[model samples]
Target chain A: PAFIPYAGAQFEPEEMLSKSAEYYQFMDHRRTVREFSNRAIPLEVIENIVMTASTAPSGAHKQPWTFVVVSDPQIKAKIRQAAEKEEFESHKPFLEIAPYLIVVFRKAYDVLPDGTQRKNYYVQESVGIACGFLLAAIHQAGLVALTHTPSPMNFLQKILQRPENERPFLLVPVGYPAEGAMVPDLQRKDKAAVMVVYHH
Target chain B: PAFIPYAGAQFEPEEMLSKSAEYYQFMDHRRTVREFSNRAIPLEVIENIVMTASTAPSGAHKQPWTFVVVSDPQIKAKIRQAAEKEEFESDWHKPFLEIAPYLIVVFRKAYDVLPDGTQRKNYYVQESVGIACGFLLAAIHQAGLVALTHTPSPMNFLQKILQRPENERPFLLVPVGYPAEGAMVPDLQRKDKAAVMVVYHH
Candidate 1:
């Protein structure tokens, strides 16, 4: 049978209804778990996640960000050492948690016609949005993940050997959770409490 | 017709495919457009979109973000003026080409109590807040509507006009609506998977 198409697959009204509710029910039943499957996921799956993330809008379309996935044993070990060092300090003062950090990098320089370094606009915001898309895509893909940010993350750039143009963003520790992972008890404000409406 | 469902809508699962090439193909079509139509839409519909966005997980369960919607003509005008002023001074000139009728602002603030003039921690604040906005963008595009991310420089002006709190700073502004008649976008090419993602036990 020949299939009729609308405004592409996403524009179909039914799929739109299920996925695009402005008042979508809160489904934040996820946790910050250190328990990882240790099983390898398809590189293509990770790529698809990034593809969805790239669709995220940026300031002036700069798209000033990068995702450096450290899956190499030596690289991960280096990250673990630097991260654990920072965590040891933070945890000593009760400020750090989570393992398996996935570092997000913000590009600090842009290419110039003269091949010189140029400043970027809204590095924090742009990278933040891209990472946001990354997490949502990860969740929709049915993978458990957590975000870990160790203060003074300068070591990440050194250990990862990223260029001077890249700065640390956030450390996302993804995988299954430990036997009993727990997050700080918190509550989100309702729509009425946190949102505003207009009728004119 | 025994055992009829509540809505009488038969069940089917054509949209729930895993990470096939199709899933990537599905999300790849998502785009941001600034054109919008003022036609009235159901209140519940917009509400559901927010619900989907709010579902994004946050750091430490702080959920440190807010989504504010502006629909009033006067308020919209005020926002437009402020936004335009910022846009005029911004690197992008002639903002109308990428403008949407509705401006959705994402605000981030420190939730915990702090000294009167001290800074509080919003750990992973931008990242967590962004994930929610990402869901919001996808939801809007998925809802058969066109939405664009509009970031006017010195977004602090929004706090002035909107009367947002001191603790809450602006994040991203999403202009959402139906695309203009025959809207066009700049050509873009995405990087390949080998350049982006590497998965393994680490």
Candidate 2:
């Protein structure tokens, strides 16, 4: 592929300062919600959010990912059962009630129709980056979601019935917040703790 | 810790559709560029952006990541030299390391350091840090700045260059700055939504 003149947005310092501060304040308000209302969201909204995430840059531009959306009560029930079996101490009925369960699968390798396979570079990192964008789009759309990443994701693969190439990475239950919902006590490390500067 | 009443934004479905579409279009315009202008950005802006990335959810809320910012020309020169040599055999050249006004090197922490000097392990460190880097990228784009997610293999050199701690391993070496006048990038389009999306309407 040939290179072309790039035409992306640029801003003045004042504008940059204002936008960056505003974005941080908005993103800081984001929290992982476990309680969700049964309210239905426009499929187009989720579609747009996923598209925004798909635009994330990947290693060698291999765009290795697959998003499996499940609204079926049966499939959601199966996922919750299998996952909860591993997470024996917990039970989340929200899985079956949420409007959508977005199962983000990382493509470890590419397979052709005839079984020719090729490996992808930075598969884990790329998928995580996409999910990062995924959450950003979700929050910007004025919706809340739970980043339900479970250990031993093998159950998700079996339940979703995806090919071996598509390994489950993260599961998100996205929907509107329920009335009188509550979240556990939570906070983050301040900027000074997370960042170090080397200035001359 | 006791639970508290949740507070977050809510909107009508019509508003949700409009915002999602607008955000996607804004993100779709993002591209990775190798060229940069020496135009300096306010340090506070970069700080705010990094803070935005830190807002990402992490495994167990461990928040196992660190951002090392470099503006000193001498350190920046060392990075460019190391990256160029690392690229000599397998990778390509990189001068943007020095030309870019700032380099934000993200480091993944394997475990937490306690005040008592014990290490508490972090789960899924790589995934957590990478996701934060993704958030970092989004913040940069929205701020109208250009950034490249540069990964120099055998990244130990970056740790040495920045003098990072043992628990902190180098992940992504990002160059954040303004693009050169009329800079160029490879023309490419993202995959179609229909090909990558599957919906169960039940």
Candidate 3:
């Protein structure tokens, strides 16, 4: 197999701990906002976030994911309309209002340009990991995002004209929070409830 | 509903962009390693990484995940044995078993426990935990540590060995520590930008 030169950054243990703490605090502030502002986000920011999302590791290094960024008003409107059909719990006005709608598409199997099919391992797990990175990148960029999974997201593929090989995984509406946006008063599970330690 | 003051940091768009770039480069360097150095990691580091993982947004805030950190050598040997019995392609369980100091087993809760002995439905169980595990692996990498994500099929043996409750289902097994000297990773190129992304500028 071919190889390339690789020199990863080396940091002292103290700095490692400090950096982890800082990142944790910074990410802890991320919240899912439903209300969105119509502020225009620079295209470069979105590009960077998507690129970061693609950096996530995948099963067998397949990287079986595609990210579609939609900003056309008509397209957003059609997506919102289709999503509302499946959405019953809460309407996603943010889909239309948010400046950008990032539709994360998971490839069930790789479709080569020649139309041959290749198996993709752990499609759900791999795409979910990438989406997690996408969310962090959005939050790190000082933008708020909402994870809108409109059941039967097939409408997204139909409306967006994505190929049959690509199925919608998560629809994220990204933008600044609307002024006076409110989130629920929620508490995280206590540490003990989520962690167990065994040392012999 | 009661609410508490939650003020998030406000940063300049440039700063945000720059930070994103820095983080991207840092995380992009992360690679899965099979060989490990037997250096002991401070328990505090493991705790922080796990806490960082819990910060991942879950479906309905159910936080349907449990992280089990195993440091006991005896138990690690037992897990390695069970895992080796099933592993065919690669011999990872041995290196990680003997060298890595901690094995973090992520468990997905099928349902939330109610005080009334009832079960609360969990939405998007697989996806939520998968995201959390991504955060965890990134955290481990950011801390200048190396880890291997091990998923052994029929991992029911883990639940029994770990003595976990029925609701907790094994999702991922991560071995964390420093990379062994001269550890070599395959040079894999990421998919090109044009390959993975599509954009429509308004």
Candidate 4:
């Protein structure tokens, strides 16, 4: 890939102020939900959301991620059983109740055509960034999601029959919230506490 | 904290389809830039963007991330100097280092110091911080700014230069501002939807 003239969007100072403020307020309301509605979602919506996540930047442009979307009740049952078996230590029955389970897998290396191996840079960071984008897109769609990192997600690899190069990263359940669903009244750190400034 | 009645937004299926499609198109255009204009940005905007990042969910709700926003010319010079030295060549990113109005250095806390001066463990520190960085990047683009995920390997120099504590480790160094006039970027393609996603339904 060669360098081309870049034409990114630019906003005036006032727009910048309002955009930043508005974006923060919107994102602030994004909460992790424990319960979800069983209402069916159109596959188009899930595909679009996944594409939004694929837009994330990656190391050396290697998009080392695979999103496995499971809507099969039997598979969900198996996953729920495996996860709960481990979670004797966790309650995410939403795993089965939710319309879809988005399992994020991170690939640490590439298996080229000739049976040679190529390593990926910042695999963890890149995949996590993609998850962030995925969550944001879920929010934009007016849907709720939870980042379910079930202890020992290796079971996902077996259940999905994924390639050896890929390992489970974050398991997210996406859909509408159940009626009268409740969430912890959590507060995030204020700007003063989270950010330090140094000026010229 | 007690559980509160959740009042999240819900849209009709038609609206979800449109919102999902529209948001994907908007995000698909975001790119990483190496050239930054020497323009000053309001600190309030920067603060707002960081707050967006802070909203990211962390394991056990630790929120174990710290953002250091630096705009000092001298400090930028020091960073560029030390960075080029450690990077061992190429002034490719040097101009942006000092020219961009802000360099946000993100740090992840592995453990917190409690009142007893003892260590309180954090859950999934690496994943939490990485997701937060992703949110930080999205916020930058939404605000109509450009930035590069410039990771100088073995980033201890960033900590030493910024005087970050031992518990906090450097994650990413982002130079944020308007793109330089006629600035060029590598034209690259992301994987197709078919290549990245697999849906199984019954």
Candidate 5:
């Protein structure tokens, strides 16, 4: 395939290594929080998170993901109502407390501007990658998030009135942790436990 | 949920922004490549990439993913033969298949095995592993290396050749190495910020 001149970055090797180690440490502290402060966050911050997520690579570069940011009280109430029925946990309460609920939708097929459908490759994998980026970006913004999944998430589709081609992938409640927020103090797996190596 | 004493890092707001922005920009430059240089990469680097990927959150904290790094030449040759049968375009990644130094086979566990040999369900298996893979790709790029994610139809040959258990399913096959001389990638543009995001602010 033909290519054009690609503009790539050049950084000091020492600086790159330093930054990578720092990032690993930074990301290591991220935890899933269920309690959220009601304080509203600025709109631009959410925009930046979404933009960072969109930077994720997708299959065939299809970019088959839609981020539905919901801040409306009425909609949040409706979502809480539906989510509560399936999830008996505190996820419902957090939905009400969190100022913003970002609903990630995975497009199963491309619906063109002409209302025609096209096949999307690696739909699940691509959207999953985007959601991962979304989570990391959310953490980087110094906010807490809970990856809430209620089985039979069909309620989200009807409540949000998303297009038929889009299916609910993840629902993240984003906000600052409430006063004295507590998370399960679980230890992450150490390097030796998680990694296996083979070199010829 | 009960908690234990958590020792988390405290960084200034400015430091957080600086580090996060650098990561975003650093990740932005990562591109998938088809051609690869046969230069050998250190085993420690591969281990670091895998460790970084495992840091991603998983459903129920099950961590239902495995990193199988293959560096044996005989195995690589066999994989190349199998992968080439299904995919002809890009010659089934012929250049990278032969040139790349390592092939990281990411596997997703459908269920967990209890110490007593009982089956434990793994929730959101697909989504969780996919997210880990996204992190893995970022780590690879950050390590100053290139990787091509390949998923040919019926990746069962990998499982059989590697003798993986029934619970382990192949999720992705990544070829890790440096870029070959004069390797070319298509000139592609990502969607505009507005195109991929729909914001509803209060």
Candidate 6:
């Protein structure tokens, strides 16, 4: 059973095949929703989502990710205030999108006691994968989310008051759908279109 | 009643109330495995996984991403040869821990031209979601195999070699499939809850 942790559910072989297609489609149906009912979501669920994200592969397996989920009406409003300050400025210049925000912070390069500022390998890649897992877990829970990354997000560092090691990455707004919510009529290219088989 | 897409199954009612603690524990089990087996995996599964990753949100709704699945033994070998040559000299001397047979090359930034000579606004955000998609697909693939991130330096050059657009960045090189006959990972512990989670009222 040593492999169970990494392999996931190898024991349920039949379930794997049956769910593969369905899981993919379920994921496909996931969309970026900006509407919120201001309704309360369970704290444990948010915790679980963050937990799932932490398991994401990091640079040299460093797993350097920090998540700050704000739901308190007051706290959400303060974050909204800070984000709106920056996003509204962008939108004023016609640059804002995504309804709400969940600020993602990426830990910047670290300095060793030996005065070495060793770069974190694949920090962006690690956090991005973790965020993707977070979104999927949210979708599986029957909720929806939209990933939002605002520029000059350094304000988020001031707002969230996080450590120097952590820098904001993406802002995911999670909640129920807006009536008549419309997503782009996008086209996902066919497999053969993107796949390359040198020796089929 | 019109949201159903898969085989006409109605969108299952939002099942938030049904999430168990283990539902999360189960998801947390996901990891990136570098070893892969050459067994021919169903292309349908790969298709679905790509679709799943594509749905991730990006800046300006640009949705920039490309999932190029390489299953052909020759292409895999060529890619392995090239990726390793660069990877060996990479910051981490080890090559992707191990060369996974199936490499999912995720490209961010689209090649499609914009009216303005300047590229579209969709930038590093694609890098964010592209890798996220890799993790999503990796977890879905994890049900049967192992997968891990393979970042080779100057990976941007992969776009040129792969003949993708200037805008599209190489977000990650995920090698997916079974672990080697015998594989091992470093023993690690995740940071405690206080170190990661936050509570508005706690």
Per-residue lDDT of A50-122 in model 5, one digit per residue for the tens? 7677778788888898888899888787888877767665546888889899988888888789989998899
lDDT of each: 0.60, 0.88, 0.82, 0.89, 0.76, 0.59
Chain A TM-score of candidate 1 vs. true chain A: 0.75
Per-residue accuracy of model 1 over B104-140 as CA lDDT, tens digit each? 7778866644569666566667777777777777667
Clashing pairs in 5: none
Question: How well does candidate 6 score on lDDT at residue B183?
Answer: 57
Q: Is the docking of candidate 6 incorrect, acceptable, medium or high quality?
A: acceptable
Tell how far residue B145 is off in model 2, in angstroms.
0.7
Poorly placed runs, candidate 6 (over 4 Å) = A1-17, A90-101, A110-119, A178-199, B1-20, B90-101, B114-124, B131-135, B153-157
When sorted by DockQ, best at the front, the candidate numbers are 4, 2, 3, 5, 6, 1
True contacts kept of 3: 0.57
* Candidate 5, residue A29: lDDT: 77
* Candidate 3 lDDT, A165-190, residue by residue in tens: 88888889998888788877877776
TM-score of each: 0.79, 0.97, 0.94, 0.97, 0.89, 0.80
lDDT of 5 at A150: 36
| lDDT (10s digit) by residue, model 2, range A1-200 | 88888788789999999999999999988988898888988899999999999999898888898888888888888887877777885588778778899999899988988999988988888889999999999999988888877444877877677898888888999899889889877988997889998989
Ranking by TM-score: 4, 2, 3, 5, 6, 1
Best candidate, DockQ-wise? 4
| Residue A64, candidate 4: alpha-carbon lDDT | 96
- For model 5, state the Cα shift of residue B78 in Å: 1.5
Quote the lDDT for B3 in model 2: 84
Q: Write the per-residue lDDT of candidate 4 for residues B97-199, one digit (tens) a residue.
A: 8999999998899988787889988989888988998899999999999898878433877888888888889888888999999899887878998889988
lDDT of 6 by residue, B1-202 (tens): 1342222111233346355245567655555554444444565555556666665666655556667676666555556666666756623333442345456777765544566776546555655564556445644654565676667434755666567766666777766666655455555667776766654452
- Select the stronger candidate by lDDT from 2 and 6: 2
